[PDB]
Design goal:
The protein is α+β, with helices and mostly antiparallel strands. Helix content is 16%, strand content 18%. It starts with a strand and ends in a 7-residue tail after the last helix. The structure holds a RNA duplex. The PDB classes it as rna binding protein.
Length: 1536
Amino acid sequence: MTTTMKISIEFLEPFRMTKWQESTRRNKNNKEFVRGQAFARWHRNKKDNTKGRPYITGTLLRSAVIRSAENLLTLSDGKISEKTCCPGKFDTEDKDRLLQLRQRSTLRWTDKNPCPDNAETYCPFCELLGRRFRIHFGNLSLPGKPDFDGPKAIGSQRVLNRVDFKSGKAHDFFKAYEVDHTRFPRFEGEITIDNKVSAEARKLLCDSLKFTDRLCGALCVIRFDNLAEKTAEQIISILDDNKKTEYTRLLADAIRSLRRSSKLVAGLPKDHDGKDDHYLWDIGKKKKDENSVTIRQILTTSADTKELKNAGKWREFCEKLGEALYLKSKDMDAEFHGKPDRLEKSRSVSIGSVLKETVVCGELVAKTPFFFGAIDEDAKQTDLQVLLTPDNKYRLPRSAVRGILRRDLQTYFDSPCNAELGGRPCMCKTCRIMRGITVMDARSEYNAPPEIRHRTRINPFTGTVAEGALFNMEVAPEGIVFPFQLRYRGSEDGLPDALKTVLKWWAEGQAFMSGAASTGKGRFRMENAKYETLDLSDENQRNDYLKNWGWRDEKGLEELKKRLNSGLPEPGNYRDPKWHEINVSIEMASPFINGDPIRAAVDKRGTDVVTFVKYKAEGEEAKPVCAYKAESFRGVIRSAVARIHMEDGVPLTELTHSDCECLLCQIFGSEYEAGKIRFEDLVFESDPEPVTFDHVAIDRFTGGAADKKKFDDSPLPGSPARPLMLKGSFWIRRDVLEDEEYCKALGKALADVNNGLYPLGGKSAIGYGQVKSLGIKGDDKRISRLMNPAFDETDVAVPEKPKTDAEVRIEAEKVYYPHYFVEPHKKVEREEKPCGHQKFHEGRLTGKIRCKLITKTPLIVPDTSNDDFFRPADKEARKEKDEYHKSYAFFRLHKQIMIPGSELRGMVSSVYETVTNSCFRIFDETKRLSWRMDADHQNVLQDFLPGRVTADGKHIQKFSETARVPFYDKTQKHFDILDEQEIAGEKPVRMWVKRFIKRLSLVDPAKHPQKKQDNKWKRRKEGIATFIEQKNGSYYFNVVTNNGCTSFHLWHKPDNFDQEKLEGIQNGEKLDCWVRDSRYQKAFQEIPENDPDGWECKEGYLHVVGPSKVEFSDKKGDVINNFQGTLPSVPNDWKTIRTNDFKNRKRKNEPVFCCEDDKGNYYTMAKYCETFFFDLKENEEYEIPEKARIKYKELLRVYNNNPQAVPESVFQSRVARENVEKLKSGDLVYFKHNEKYVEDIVPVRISRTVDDRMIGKRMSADLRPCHGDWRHPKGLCPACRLFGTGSYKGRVRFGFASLENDPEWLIPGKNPGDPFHGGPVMLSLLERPRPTWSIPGSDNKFKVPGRKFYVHHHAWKTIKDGNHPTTGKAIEQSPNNRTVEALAGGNSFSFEIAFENLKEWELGLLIHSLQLEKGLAHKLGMAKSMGFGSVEIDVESVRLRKDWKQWRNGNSEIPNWLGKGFAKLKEWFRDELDFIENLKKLLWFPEGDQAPRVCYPMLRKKDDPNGNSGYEELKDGEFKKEDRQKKLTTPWTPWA
RNA sequence: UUGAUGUCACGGAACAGGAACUUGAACAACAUCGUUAC
RNA sequence: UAGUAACGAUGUUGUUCAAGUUCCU
């Protein structure tokens, strides 16, 4: 007897949904069940398991329909069709049930009786209220009734907020799910309306259903009728296989960066030779086992698998892979909800019968990257994230637009509302409007990943970052466009004034929507405004608005967007928006860098840091542009303000801003209230192409690049020719400009910044940044009036340089050496506390210095961008891979001759650090040394005994003695009769040994004229002689010793005087003879057929190493000559090499083996024997400590890595041929013991000896790098307080030097008329330095000498000629010398030097070190072992800075400073100033008619046209072993 | 998968504070191999 | 019985980032 009507809702906006809960806290007492009553619910079948589906109840729809009906009747005076309606009833006397009352002030129309219940003919409205059910509202659910496995399958729990208004930060919050509508856009249900209801109540229900528009926080229209895990596993396996386990986080952060596109993986960088040996993109590979994969291979093959070809797949893959790697790397409260008041009765009030509706379409675009924080879980790599759509589209939620409209409305009036989440609705002026506003979401259809940014927080006590401040953040692109649609219905005749004013504000570009706005995030600007006002009061109009569901749906919206007139309605009373723009323009004079190492690691240019770059969207694609972060600029200006004002003694950079109204706490804000100034990024107005400068860290001792310390960087170029402008803006609140204290502080700070202090950018310590002029405009001279440069010009020239006093005695016929170490003192002072980079202190100085660099010897400063600068053109450029002769140019920035500031900083820092006897800034505390031990029995080889390590690597069993077995000869066969299991040293062998051979002579006492002078015939006894056979070379004999107990046969060789008794031979003659004993240590397999004498059979271990000790050469040496032609080739394998020739030919002495390869090499190989250790003594083993293992590892490392070794792999020793890395169970060892402990292990008979202590422990314990904790403590070497260190900023900045006049090259160029290019010169070999020649021995008598200052001389005339410095022979090109273009003497450069917080004596010593005495000179440039690079420096104006107004040129105080500095130096050391005497002796310059010849020695004396006793003779006599330390420390000692 | 005579949740901005920065001359001379003789 | 004496040849490149903080109020 009923009829069913089925309905269906289609959402237009992400709806919300509450959380499941068990059926016990489902009462009006749980504050979380309520406050979630107007959302959708989530039922899970099979309770206690999160598996279910969502639904919308029916009571909710009923209440919405009731409310809309109430709204509809009062709109038509209560006449439904013909009859009138009753006023309805909303009172019920019971209040135990009804977990929610009503607090809404229901409407009113045609006041009359409330139609009591005891009746029969109800009012249609009461027929709808339900006075077995007349109307039954059924549940709604999903169409197909599916089942998912949890709420996190369709939604994402996000946090919502509630901010204050005065202290505009926050309050309590609360979180609630929300589900997208592009994946669940339809529900379904039904309504069972009874038969005997009415014919108009059905119409009322139809209209009311068509009038409702929002159900669960979202607009609705109701109608009726598997790889990344294993890839990460494998990559971690690669990284742990090798020891490269510390590049893991960098790999994660760099791989995650590839999600932008899959075409970058084929563009990863390469090594410095174009090879494929990057330092992290090619880990895992090994020389052996080319089946080993590299990371680049993994990334290239997985870049194309037909499933990672779509954008979304590749992006998801990169993201999850990065997260996995990161998580692998890492392990190496007040939510107020509800309080609705349970009110008994609602205050029924009426509102009227007019209702006007206003629709405003249009769109708002972005003008600056925005930010809507939505930090989720299970993604812990970014820690400041944005809000995205399940298909990666940028959205702005409606809650944000609503909150911002509320804030702007409150700002238009001057009254903050104070609603408190409960009770009667508020009635103030700004909530009577916000109760009729409806907005909509947006999607922006951009679909591209967001960029990342890095941030820090600098500690203003040392200058570096604080312990625990470094975080990421991601910002959406700039220029994205969202659609916008706003609607308002009420009683006015259109929009109120407030809304017109606020929309005009947004139409002028001041819609500061949300985000970290303090640093210039989103600032949207509304465009293309339209509007149109409908009229719900009449009847011909309302019916149409009801016929098509208003115009909420898509087609309705499109049909309606053709009926609007353009242009917003201008207000009646404007209000002058409260944010005022200010323009900024900076101009630089140097390079500029803003670090970004991750992009550098991915980029193809192959550098280490690359400047910052941002993107901007154009609808579907981005286009990069170079910029300067806004956080950095804000920080610079803030730290400029904070170091000036005092605020009751302690400067502002020491407070904590707990509750104080500090001047900072009111312009830049704090963590208790918002700020009053907002910045913006700075675009460059140009697109300069970046450059690349190289760097290196010259060690102090043995000046030459330290290990692992080369690098580079890619800053932007800028010079006084092109000054690299910067444009920007920043907004400031209106009621700050009207103040008179704040604008004063801002003006003062910008005055400080414009004067040159506070450099913008990165490595400002070598001349980056250097702001030149900062001019702002747009504030009516309210700030731009404190920034005028005002100073004085009190002129006084600089005091002239003092006269030198250190002299040298230099003559001719003597040659000198170019190193001359400078021994240091023994006391470094470290008991002063550093100052700190806070307020400019009072008793200290701060200013600039300008100098003037003038050269007096050719100078070389190369430009290492490209080689082959001097290439003869009109020929092929180059093959892909070759070893050519590298040619360089001079340094040029924009076709201008300059000198980088780092050079000058290094030079001045070395001089100034050795003046004051300070800690070795950079130094190498590793790399234990090693020397080839000499050949002499009494000295080194007496103590090295044979041995053998046991089966367990803990003991060595010594042998007793040994003798040698000959291989490689022709007089035996030990390679064919022995197995590979004995010649390898594992199986004991039984050989025949002999110790003494015996000679024979016929006449002892008559040989005294010819023989009997060698004094070795002092143990002969007697001998009878026999004869049994005659030969062609010798005579057979038998002899007895004293009485016939021993009898030995042999073959005697006679001479002239022996022939006489031989003439008669009757084979039975008993001649008397004399036998002699000699030494003969040998061991054969069985016996030779020529010596059947007394041999002892022995047993022991045999070992061989192979054919080594080869004297190879390249010039057809002596022994190669006088051969018999047809030199054979190098055999393919040993055990086959036999001796050809003999070195001595008169007798058959030491043999050789001559061969030759295809190239011009000529080999020769002595060592025709191997050794055999026998008599393995038992019950005697020695323990191996770990020092022996370390030393042996080092020895093997030195053996197997040798650039000078023999090219033939067969002539090498066994340690180098097989690449052994550890001592195994049993092998060949010559150990050396002392009281049950071994000390050294050496593989061969004569090998190198390693020292134990690393080089770092051979200095004084106080000259090691003054580093460590040993605010900041006081323990710093005096040179690490002027120049910085790790964890303390320096206080001196150098600058790029520039040349003004004409170049005046060394040798003229190839084309005259163009005097901007020089001619090339060729240089010598210039090999690396050998720290083992100044530390000859290893025991304890040798310490580390000084700092290796090169001397001044004129040896460049020879190189300009073209001959070698030592010899006079010509020098030819090869891939080991360079060809550079150089300058000459007599050019002038000019640079600047800034400082700050200097004492009065630190400046004294610094200005001593900048300009020296009148006869000395500095030294910088390439190849200064020859004569190249000799500069002296003069100091011009020294203008100080007394206060931010004036500058007070201080030329006229230098002698005061110099005296004070020298007085301090004298205070440190009383009369122990020898090192300064030496240092002055070394910087002396040959002034005139003094041409001291210096050069490096040669190897031997027989390869120089002059014969000056090269190195091989200096090793004894003058520089023997003890006089090196002395004859090298003396400043000038002739090399003789 | 609710309950009926009473739901302003379009009733609540995930907001407020933070300098990818500190230190570092693109440079440079003597080593590398083992045994042979008595 | 029971180890002593020290000679011969002249050729050749290397490092290409390291040490720090990596999130909190």
